[PDB]
Design a protein around this ligand. Structure first.
Ligand SMILES: [K+]
Ligand SMILES: [K+]
Ligand SMILES: [K+]
Ligand SMILES: [Mg+2]
Ligand SMILES: [Mg+2]
Ligand SMILES: [Mg+2]
Ligand SMILES: [Mg+2]
Ligand SMILES: [Mg+2]
Ligand SMILES: [Mg+2]
Ligand SMILES: [Mg+2]
Ligand SMILES: [Mg+2]
Ligand SMILES: [Mg+2]
Ligand SMILES: [Mg+2]
Ligand SMILES: [Mg+2]
Ligand SMILES: [Mg+2]
Lengths: 113, 118, 78, 92, 117
RNA sequence: AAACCACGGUAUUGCAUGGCUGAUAUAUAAUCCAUACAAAGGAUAUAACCAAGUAGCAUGGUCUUAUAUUGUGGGCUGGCGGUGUGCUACAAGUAACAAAAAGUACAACCGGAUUAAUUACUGAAAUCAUAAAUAUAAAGAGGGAAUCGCUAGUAAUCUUUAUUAUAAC
């Protein structure tokens, strides 16, 4: 079983497995399965072809997913860079946007864009 | 010519004369706040009343700057020691800095306050 | 019709109670009542500093006297 | 940020500066600004905490940074931000 | 207190009024329904957990069968007593009107005045 | 702002000084906490070599109408390296979630950092304050030479209160 070209583990619960989709988390994954009539006791290996199709259709209509979500986030960052605001410069330089980070700013340095 | 003598206190409870700095300017701010307190409260109520339309509330917001000085804002007032004028280390319940309060307590000049142990 | 006193809506009871004793103010309202319900502290702030008059009628100015003794106790300037 | 239901904040001094500018250049304000002509002059201000409004389009602002007035020309992408975000105070 | 000549103590103004429901019913000839409605309107005392300070102007105590009213709106001791007495009469008028009962000299005396409302 | 005027100065000398304090810390006590139905342990006080520390305050010498008093914005938070004191974790599932299907999820879905969009709250003013929620879901699998605290209601671990516009690890 794969949704949005993401393989769901067979032995895990459906609402837990859907978190692996870029753009769905705990609270939102639980909403999707219950909206389709699937409770927490249903595992991936218990699903059928019709069940997968319902989930795929519901996600596409309500949520923004892996490729479109990544593009949307990047375009937001690029706009700030072109505007040349304080935050835009920090994104371009590859450092955090907080006021005082001369002592602890390592995570923002390794997660550059 | 004109003179402006520094504010100092000579009290029998302390062997030395006690000087202070910058209490007049803070008193001026406290007087101005009391002067404009009534109008400020009225405009605060109107700007946080949801029953009024936004175009009307925007115009009221401009009254905070045209109808009163910036120095009547309550957030710019600080508490200084009444004897020395120091800001840091103030003990609010007595109104004095920790340096003066400690010495006065040792000689019993603060009612009811004494050393503690337990 | 006869309505027993034990079957009166709480809404009507609240309206009667608040119509007599007043309506309390909630924590976060947008009616503009919170500002007007707070006490005024204009006088309490302006009577905080210890500012006795420089010259008290009938008494000597000890601070002025203190300064004069200091000048006499040391050499004159220029 | 400022609660949305309480509206945007703009300084009274900034508004007076713009009103005077419009009176000086009525033709550009009504017609020229929309065709794409540049502002005939710049407005210097200290109001770094004011919000940029859609009505401020094609205007040139000199925003104080501590030493001089840094030129800032308003673009559509800048609407909704503060004037102080486009005038840097520190330099490396 | 030592500062009496410089500031008036804030606790001089508040006053409280207490009445026993059983005696009040007998004096004014209130019916059982009227008394039951009066108790429901008062309700138990409400104290905020943040400060444990009573916030209910009116409350009913079942153990002592007492109806209590607190008045502290104004700065004057007497002005609060006038306020408290008026509020008590308002409660009686509302309960009596909904559930009329026996007529007593006290009730007739109040009716001629109109409950001072 | 002071009239046979007592100008002001976060200017300088702590190696000219007052006052106050860091720095030996056992032992003892007509002191404090607790006690009244059987007990244990603490707190406070107790005279210093160190030219040790001192733009709170006071003071001798020297300097200065103004090295004074004030308005607006900016800075004290600053694209880099070193490192002290703390908080949150991971080896070790004795974890995690929880209103028990006498449970639920997972097999470090343990850990909760960073960034995007959005809203509320305080305030005259919130890009460079705080909180919540949605998405994102980083380092970390017990740590070199070396080094610190404590010896029982103590270490370890958990909750709460106070100093106290908004804002405590
Ligand atoms: K810490
Ligand atoms: K370690
Ligand atoms: K312990
Ligand atoms: Mg996901
Ligand atoms: Mg200076
Ligand atoms: Mg020394
Ligand atoms: Mg020395
Ligand atoms: Mg030292
Ligand atoms: Mg030194
Ligand atoms: Mg300033
Ligand atoms: Mg600092
Ligand atoms: Mg573990
Ligand atoms: Mg977890
Ligand atoms: Mg493990
Ligand atoms: Mg890993």
């Amino acid at each position: 079983v794969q949704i949005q070209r993401v393989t769901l583990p067979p032995h895990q619960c459906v609402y837990m497995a859907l978190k692996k989709v870029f753009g769905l988390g705990g609270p939102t994954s639980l909403a999707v399965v219950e909206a389709c009539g699937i409770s927490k006791g249903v595992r991936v290996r218990d699903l059928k072809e019709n069940h997968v199709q319902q989930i795929t259709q519901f996600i596409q209509d309500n949520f923004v997913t892996e490729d479109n979500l990544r593009r949307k986030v990047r375009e937001d960052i690029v706009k700030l860079v072109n505007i040349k605001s304080r935050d835009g410069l920090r994104h371009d330089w590859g450092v955090s946007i907080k006021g005082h980070t001369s002592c602890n700013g390592k995570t923002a340095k390794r997660l550059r864009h | 010519t004109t003179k402006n003598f520094r504010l100092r206190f000579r009290i029998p409870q302390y062997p030395d004369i006690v000087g202070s700095r910058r209490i007049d300017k803070d008193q001026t701010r406290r007087v101005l706040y009391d002067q404009h307190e009534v109008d400020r409260r009225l405009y605060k109520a109107m700007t946080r009343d949801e029953s009024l339309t936004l175009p009307v509330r925007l115009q009221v917001q401009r009254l905070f700057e045209t109808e009163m000085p910036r120095d009547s804002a309550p957030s710019r007032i600080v508490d200084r020691c009444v004897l020395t004028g120091r800001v840091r280390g103030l003990v609010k319940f007595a109104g004095l800095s920790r340096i003066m309060l400690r010495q006065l307590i040792h000689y019993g000049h603060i009612g009811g306050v004494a050393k503690a142990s337990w | 019709s006869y309505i027993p006193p034990s079957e009166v809506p709480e809404e009507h009871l609240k309206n009667i109670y608040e119509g007599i004793f007043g309506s309390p103010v909630a924590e976060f309202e947008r009616t503009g009542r919170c500002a007007l319900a707070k006490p005024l502290i204009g006088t309490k702030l302006s009577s905080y500093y210890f500012l006795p008059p420089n010259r008290q009628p009938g008494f000597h100015n000890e601070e002025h006297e203190y300064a004069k003794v200091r000048l006499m106790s040391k050499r004159q300037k220029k | 940020g400022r609660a949305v239901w309480r509206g945007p904040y703009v300084s009274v001094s900034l508004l007076e500066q713009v009103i005077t500018f419009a009176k000086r250049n009525p033709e550009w304000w009504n017609i020229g600004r929309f065709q794409g002509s540049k502002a005939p002059e710049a407005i210097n201000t200290f109001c770094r905490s004011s919000t940029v409004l859609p009505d401020f389009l094609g205007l040139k602002f000199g925003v104080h940074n501590g030493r001089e007035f840094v030129g800032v020309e308003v673009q559509e992408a800048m609407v909704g931000h503060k004037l102080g975000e486009f005038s840097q105070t520190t330099f490396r | 207190h030592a500062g009496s000549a410089f500031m008036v103590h804030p606790r001089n103004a508040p006053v409280q009024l207490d009445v026993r429901v059983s005696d009040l019913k007998q004096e004014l000839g209130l019916s059982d329904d009227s008394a039951a409605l009066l108790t429901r309107l008062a309700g138990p005392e409400r104290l905020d957990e943040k400060t444990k300070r009573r916030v209910s102007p009116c409350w009913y105590n079942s153990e002592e069968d007492t109806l209590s009213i607190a008045a502290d709106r104004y700065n004057d001791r007497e002005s609060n007593r006038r306020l408290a007495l008026e509020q008590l009469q308002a409660l009686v008028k509302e309960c009596d009107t909904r559930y009329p009962g026996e007529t007593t000299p006290a009730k007739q005396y109040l009716s001629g005045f109109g409950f001072f409302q």
